[PDB]
Write a protein that binds this ligand. Sequence first.
Ligand SMILES: Nc1ncnc2c1ncn2[C@@H]1O[C@H](COP(=O)(O)OP(=O)(O)NP(=O)(O)O)[C@@H](O)[C@H]1O
Ligand SMILES: [Mg+2]
Length: 226
Amino acid sequence: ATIGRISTGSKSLDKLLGGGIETQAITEVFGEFGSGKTQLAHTLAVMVQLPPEEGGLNGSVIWIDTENTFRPERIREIAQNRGLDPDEVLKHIYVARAFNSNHQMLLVQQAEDKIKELLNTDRPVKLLIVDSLTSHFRSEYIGRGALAERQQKLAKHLADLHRLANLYDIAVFVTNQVQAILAHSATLRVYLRKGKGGKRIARLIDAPHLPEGEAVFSITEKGIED
Ligand SMILES: Nc1ncnc2c1ncn2[C@@H]1O[C@H](COP(=O)(O)OP(=O)(O)NP(=O)(O)O)[C@@H](O)[C@H]1O
Ligand SMILES: [Mg+2]
């Protein structure tokens, strides 16, 4: 029942997060296009595989991809440059493409099967990524009355995700795109934005009991880092 933390690769962002993203929680990253949401997801999918003294949880990953932006070679590069075996690392990421929102919801039920299978093995699932949490919902639920219906379906989907996080001690990491779609209650919302000089800036939103500064990071051949 203790909480585990997965390093993001950035010391700056890790400090903002209290050491990394938490198990038994849904962390939502949100921001405009190009703000680094997907690159952070890729980095986390490598970092979680590290031992705990290196910031990981010796864990496997389930990834629900909605817009086909998962890149196996980016995983390999990030792994390679952090001293891990690129091919081994891919072996422990289980990617499924969600065709629509209803399929996305079914894939969360299927994730529980994979989770159970690995639970008391040496590489339990420790990270579940949904990229994008909201893209299908934005496309499908549109027009008069759609706000209530969309928020309703999303809340149920997030409830499924919360259950998996808490029941199996897993960090859930979801993405959400904004044009400068309420994610019910993610545990923690992190706003990402592009800054000058190729830097990215992160800020915690509506978290008055947590740090109020901003983290600054780059996107490199190691994925995310200061
Ligand atoms: N291999 C790489 N090495 C370094 N930087 C990279 C690499 N791949 C992507 N990037 C950077 O990452 C940016 C895209 O980040 P990404 O994480 O895809 O944004 P995003 O928030 O997911 N965009 P969107 O899905 O449209 O809402 C690119 O514009 C590059 O600046
Ligand atoms: Mg993306």
